[PDB]
Write a protein that binds this ligand. Structure first.
Ligand SMILES: CCn1cc(CC(=O)Nc2ccc(Oc3ncnc4cc(OC)c(OC)cc34)cc2)cn1
Length: 305
């Protein structure tokens, strides 16, 4: 489940322990076969007696030993990572006197994929009007900033020897001040009813975001996360369109990927962003850029713009 690090060997700092009786649950934000993410109010988490809204990940009674272990492993990884501005941050946990509860920060605008889809008809490639500034129009400047923030968060993950394995716009959250945060819905996503996940063997996998070595050899590395970032760039500069449009995942798809077929630039991508996508999609993982190199490339593009 984790390539370089074994999360079962990672420690859990008991400084994160929070009393479960101080949590009041609200609506369900997302749910899978064995897990769910719920909106909650945490009392006494702030130094003053002020309450705050949090997100809580938990298992359903349908979960088995495998899922119980996986939620505990997620908690250890989050505790091990520490705080980063471009990653969804750990706030606390409930490990004693009941099922395990993982408490993370609430992101007011939800997932990036749905945000892009809602903003599709309110997109401005050029500059926003001073009077129409209240309307909240999405611009090319916002898209370049989102690409930069996601590369930054990914460079941090790699420096900690962490591989995501499911990088996509659906696993990026949007909060205040146009801040994006890398996340992983994991067990709280209904993968059975999501057409972006395909039946391949005994698994349901996100094939259209996967590097060839992950599809044909089950290998996940720093370089395979870079390929998925390239697919995420295509989603972003297409304003949330599905990748490889009009093409189903079948024998013909696997053959074309192996033979070197690649998507052409999405409608709103600057040429230098499409240049990044092409290198992320190199058949040789050694020829792909690192997330650090991607960060430096986008940094130059922003300064020039
Ligand atoms: C990259 C390292 N890493 C982090 C993890 C843990 C993790 O990412 N868990 C996670 C993911 C998504 C969650 O869902 C939401 N959280 C906050 N706010 C939301 C707001 C929402 O709508 C307004 C909403 O709608 C559907 C969902 C929201 C909650 C927890 C694993 N690996």
């Amino acid at each position: 489940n984790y390539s370089y690090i074994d999360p079962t060997q990672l420690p859990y700092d008991h400084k994160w322990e929070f009393p479960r009786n101080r949590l009041s649950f609200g609506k369900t934000l997302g749910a899978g076969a064995f897990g769910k993410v719920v909106e909650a109010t945490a009392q006494g988490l702030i130094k003053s007696d002020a309450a705050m809204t949090v997100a809580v990940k938990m298992l359903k009674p349908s979960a088995h030993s495998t899922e119980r272990e996986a939620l505990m492993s997620e908690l250890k990884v989050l505790s091990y990572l520490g705080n980063h501005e471009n990653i969804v941050n750990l706030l606390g946990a409930c490990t004693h006197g009941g099922p395990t509860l993982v408490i993370t920060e609430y992101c007011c605008y939800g997932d990036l994929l749905n945000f892009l889809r809602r903003k599709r008809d309110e997109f401005v490639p050029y500059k926003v009007a001073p009077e129409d500034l209240y309307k909240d129009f999405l611009t090319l400047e916002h898209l370049l900033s989102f690409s930069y923030q996601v590369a930054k968060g990914m460079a941090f993950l790699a420096s900690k020897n962490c591989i995501h394995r499911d990088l996509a716009a659906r696993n990026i959250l949007l909060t205040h001040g146009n801040i994006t945060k890398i996340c992983d819905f994991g067990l709280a996503r209904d993968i059975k009813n999501d057409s972006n996940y395909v039946d391949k063997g005994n698994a349901r996998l996100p094939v259209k975001w996967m590097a060839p070595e992950s599809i044909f050899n089950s290998v996940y590395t720093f370089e395979s996360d870079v390929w998925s970032y390239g697919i995420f760039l295509w989603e972003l500069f297409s304003l949330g369109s599905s990748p490889y449009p009009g093409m189903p995942v079948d024998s013909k798809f696997y053959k074309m990927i192996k033979e070197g077929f690649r998507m052409s630039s999405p409608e709103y991508a600057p040429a230098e962003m499409y240049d990044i996508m092409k290198t992320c999609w190199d058949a040789d993982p050694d020829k792909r850029p690192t997330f650090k190199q991607i960060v430096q490339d986008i940094e130059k593009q922003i300064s020039e713009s």
